[model samples]
Target chain A: VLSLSTAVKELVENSLDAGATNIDLKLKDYGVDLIEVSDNGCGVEEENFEGLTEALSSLCALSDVTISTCHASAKVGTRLMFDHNGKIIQKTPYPRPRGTTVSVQQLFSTLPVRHKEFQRNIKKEYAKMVQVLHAYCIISAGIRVSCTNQLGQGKRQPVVCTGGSPSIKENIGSVFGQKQLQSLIPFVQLPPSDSVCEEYALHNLFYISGFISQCTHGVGRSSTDRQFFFINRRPCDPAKVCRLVNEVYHMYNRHQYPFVVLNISVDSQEEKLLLAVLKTSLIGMFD
Target chain B: LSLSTAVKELVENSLDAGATNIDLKLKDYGVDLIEVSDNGCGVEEENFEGLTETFEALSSLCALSDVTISTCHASAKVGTRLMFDHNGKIIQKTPYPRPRGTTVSVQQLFSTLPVRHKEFQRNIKKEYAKMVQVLHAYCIISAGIRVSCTNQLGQGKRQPVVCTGGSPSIKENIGSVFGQKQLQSLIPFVQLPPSDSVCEEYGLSCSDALHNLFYISGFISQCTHGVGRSSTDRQFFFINRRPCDPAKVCRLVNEVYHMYNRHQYPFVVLNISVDSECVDQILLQEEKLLLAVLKTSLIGMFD
Candidate 1:
């Protein structure tokens, strides 16, 4: 049910749902051996301890999962572990701050086939994991996120670190280098056209703003990793959006892919004239 | 898994089970129906007993509510058709006569999830195109397998989107899906010696540069070609005859191709077969060394 990289994503999203401002992920042996996700958010209460065990027990890929959370009502946090059958193996008092830490060891060890597949390409899988972390940090700005490798020779290598800055440009500079960030131009939202609105069946479209790199911004190569899209404040796959962006980009320069960070949102209001205004303005950008 | 992904997974399973001929039929852009039939060994009698249990497990994944199987025996033909709703209640189990093959039909995909159903229906054509692309990649890489895909039910004048014979030539398959232009512009790539290293013992006569330690065969477009507005769109990578995401290898391939044209990406179909040791060694090599020489010969590393 869970892919290798998706497991990390689920935990991180859970932390985000818990209102975590700071999250740290520690990986051992490229996350095949051990994975520990810690976050400073609302911790699980003692009354819901049994429920937590039930949820984690259903994860087949996770083995020997231990969770320790410091509830707001309790003086100290509680650490517990459960077997595959939802039986509590261990529970003890943990001395920690007001946060939660979940450690998963021997991930995918229960599934022999998946475990073997995971071990085949350790380095490549780790690179993808690092990319996922970077994407998360870029999309979820204003959140302090750090990823580290714990077991290898490059022990505790800081793969990615965000300053939890309020400014989106600053976060972009941090994830992507400062040189790439410098060549970008801020994009302001334009009104949508009547025909376009009819196609999408939307009453009114709101602001769609982001940053786009210049034509001469290619630093020796062209790749799609620099492209990002957010819809209504939620990170989304840029497959369809990239198609539209690429169409506009090719008219300017055929050689380089312009780095883009677009956030689109819609509002429910009838504005026929405003809609027509946005259509021309947006279509004019390509020209 | 999504409907398109599920189809891909089933096709792979059929291929892995030694199915040489596969027929795919789509209805209403697969939002309403998806049927895949393969001429492989039908479910053995031993496995037939557990077929019910298997369907029970698959019920949670999708609405796999319809199934039909037929197998040929020396004396007679055995067949059965099953129709089940979400609750696993068998609606029918009538005996039917058919060829020795297995057919799986899924109806009303994402019916439980209305939002997903609506989105899939809205973008059904795009989803259908993606499914065809996936099927074409498998058809190209698999030389011995014959694959045919049709859009509508009736077979009057409507032509199939993909129709390939059981030919052992990848070039013929490429020409079948993509035109002759794509076939002509293809440059076959094979495994070669590391760029920086040379045969010192016979350095004077370096023509015998072939090493049988690894085998890599594929066709890469000579120049930037486009089927749509953007260039460098078609890229199919197969690792040991199975489609997989070799992200590192793809990035390296892109980086090498980037040197040739910065504006457009090249269409590539790469099939790699190498030992783990060779992969480990080459994975550590520098990009400059990998890009030193571009092999454009019609070399058949897989014979």
Candidate 2:
């Protein structure tokens, strides 16, 4: 059900859900050959290892997956190797530091056509991973995120690195540079009644807080690549939300786009009302 | 995929497989029933097992309860009817007499996922409408491909949303889909040129001018002057015959339309083709050249 990048996203989210403070990602051969992600989070329990293995086996693109999780009760962590369809092939004791490491090899090997496509566009694939990691670094301000290319000898090339600072600005600075960070304007808005709109009153909508870059912060191109929106911490692309932002930015400068980072939470029913409020508030900002 | 998107994808596959005539039937806004019949190249006995299992995974993702693939053999007078449940279990396999082509029937859409079931059930009409829009666009662009979408909600005859005769004329298809008034204002677009670098690199002789690096052709409204709305619902871009969202293309189209005024948006159907060798760099390079040529041509008409 998930794409190659989406699968990576799911694994990263799993680590985040486990309260991982530091996440390390390794890409070998641009992830066509191997992909390994390690997180210093609460590791998997030994009882649920079977379930994890079953889940891994059901994935169509995976060829081999090795999972090592340090359990709370066990003295040493358990390691298991699973085949493409999630059948456990080997199980034994492994070393880990109170965390979990998932290493996937020969990804999409079962699907030759897909594997070839990935291999051909390996650089683009790796770039996408870095871009995704950069977003997480910004959103998870206090969480350390590092990505490295494992193809080089002695020391791997640093793709992206962010210090686990408690400031979103610092994280953004780490990814896009300090120049862009300096021009971002902190934006905060609250609904009039949190239930004024009859259509979505049941959702109990609330406040929104984030940053929007000023028109002066415009870069060389006008694009939505720098725009990021999170719904309850999960990245989502709600067209209405993006369109509202674009409309606001277009009024100031048509040739360039302002960088945007917005965190919003609402029940599914609240989407329309939220968009309506956003449209009105955005127009209200300039006036 | 969303319900409408899934239907579009299935229909695209039918078209790709060289189906000339496609018949779509829906019940309860395609939540309870979605059936697509096509007179394309039917599946052979050898591919039946793989196709049935593959269909299972796709149906499961859509939360469908069952999938039935009844495909008739080519040239032969017999066909096989294969059925699969949500869990990829084979319900039945039997031989039957039928015409050439294939029929894929999906039942109980979005029944497995509760959240999706609730949201999708609430927007079934909207979803069906979107699906029809997609089908209509494809039908118009694909001149010789006849398509019919119907809603079988009542005990009476099925309600037809739109149907087109397999005419090779794009204008005829457009008129059938969007009425003759809309078709009257249409302007044809053609821009096909080999990249200079491509010619030099391959040492292609100048006399062989038809050896283009890519193919581009489509139709657009002559001008946005009389168009009533500013919506982008009518814009469609196809790459190698597959629908894609190329922002540069969209922006260029907008740039041309903006000159006409702010209140109007042009209806566009653009198709592009490029070789696989340089697909990664295709959009960047092709957009610049294509946009320049298209801008000059469109702007010249007004001047």
Candidate 3:
């Protein structure tokens, strides 16, 4: 909502939250001309609408913001252009799929300094904007998120595109290369226990499931590029949780960082109860 | 600086402490060692309770306590004051070190932390060179800071990397860091003409109004001879004397430079200083005009 990358982040999040199986993100001139995020989801509708404006307002750090949305069952779609105050300035019938598309024009147009700054660093800023979408692209299982950039008249391949794969591992393979897939091992379940029920460490304090890289020496990532954590499938930057896994992974394999794309089904504080059972479980699991 | 980490944080801290003489020593690409020493205003060393290095697992509560480290992914810990007096611990001898400052040394850089963000910057193995580049900004920008850096890879001795003995001149800083020979490649900047946009806000004429709001100076490579570099690695831009990577600024300048130089990037070390107030109404409005003038100036040079 506030930054260049975050603008794309929230828009994508809104789509994922909206239950979009197919999401497409296209940027023109690295989002100076336009930043359009389209999602084939249960489209936006209300008793007209109220709360979404508050959400969309944060992302309105641009000159023109147009949202075109069609309900999955609707015949056509409606287009809305919102003013600075999160109020609709114009509404019209628009051509659309059974999805929603948010088009942000002149993302830096809101501020004089930011505008000039963006002009100075569009490629650099846009790269990070792409990096953020990759996080959600990996965690967003059962959904396909595709991104493309139009660098002038020339064209490039899709930066990160995921097929609507059932597995989060496949989604990661699609986002990061397939060869990296060999490193990933799914966190299916804990090993069975017979007696240590009292000292049994992880007896259902919280539930966590996702992909972690194998703790084998060469299998672990040389860098922390693909590491992502989400709580309740809502992508969260739980540094403590990520750090714990890396540390525990090091106990098994030295001089390496684990590649993780984990979705913890914790029900909110939301990530504070981490580091304890998670690290303890990972310690035994990695070895 | 999203581009570099750890080293940037340490240097920026030394600057904020109003330190002049800053020394950096890295052993084995900072994985085996990272020690940064500075001379600034002294702080009481009494209130230091440092983390003990142990293989023992952290208690659940202590682990949970680490959750509030920072939400931002940038491992560059801004204003991270390393507070521990280990005079006898990390080599007590010095050149009768007087100026009353601080030194923070780190080893086993990555494995200790739960998440590896700051130390292993991009790729710890490849980024030690990039980490030293982080200090290049501080070396050239801080006119009076005597900053020196050294590196060794699990070796018998440390090699001096860069040293800019405190000088009021950025030229002196540049010569010390890059090489005194690079002094020939440098050509001082020719500033842009003032804007025509009228304003009653400042109640001054356009030229001084532009002068009051923005500051631009420093050397760029010669329009012809120093035009080609293997990459844009030599380029640097400082905003308000603090280094910033302005992607579009680099692109804009590069695009224009290519028109004249062709398939080559210019070595730019230009600094643009902003006004005390970057109000909502107009701050970098003149900034665009300033850039346009550069693009215009470069284009004009070729014509």
Instruction: In angstroms, give how far residue A215 of model 2 lies from its true place.
Output: 78
Off by over 4 Å in 1: A54-61, A151-154, A193-202, A217-221, A267-287, B1-303
| Candidate 3 C-alpha lDDT tens digits along B1-303 | 121365676577667766655666666676655656564543333322222111111121122111111001112222123322222121122121122455555554544343654545457656766666767878888885556666665534445566664457887678667765566766776655533432332233555444545556787665574446767887878877877777656787788777767767777788877664662212355555556556655554455
Tens-place lDDT digits, model 1, residues A1-287: 26546767777887898877567776767788778788767899888887775235655235678788897788998888867666667889987656688888877787887778878977777776776676688777656566655444321333455545455776786566456676787765555555555654243446666777665535322866677777766666756566767655665777777787777666534434343433444455544
Chain B TM, every candidate: 0.76, 0.83, 0.72
TM-score, chain A only, candidate 2, equals 0.86
What local distance difference test score does each model get? 0.61, 0.67, 0.62
Per-residue alpha-carbon lDDT of model 2 for B1-303, expressed as tens digits? 567776776687677677766767677678877877776777787777667302334545434557777776665567777888666656788875544577777787777777877888898778777777777778777776656666656343345466654456766677656656666666777563544554454454465545346566777877646653467778878777666677877887777677875577788877777776645513534445555555655565444
- Candidate whose lDDT is highest: 2
Cα displacement (Å) at residue A193, model 2? 82
- Model 1, B119-219: lDDT tens digits are 87788778777777787788788784556665543222223466554446887667555645666666777665643232332232234334334456787
Candidate 1 chain A: worst-modelled 10 consecutive residues by lDDT: A150-159
Clash count, candidate 1 = 4
- Could you tell me how far off, in angstroms, the CA of residue B225 lies in candidate 1 after the best superposition? 66
The list of candidate 2 runs beyond 4 A from truth reads A1-287, B53-63, B75-77, B154-157, B190-214, B228-230, B281-284
Clashing pairs in 2: A57-A85, A57-A86
Supply the TM-score of chain A against the true chain A for every candidate structure. 0.85, 0.86, 0.84
Q: Give one digit per residue, the lDDT tens place, for model 3 in A1-287.
A: 55678888878878888877567776767787778887767887734544457447765645678888887566778888888777788778766556678888888687878789888987788777766887778777656566655454342223455544556776776666556677777775553233223233434556778878898878887888677888777777877777777877888888888888888785444233345556655755775
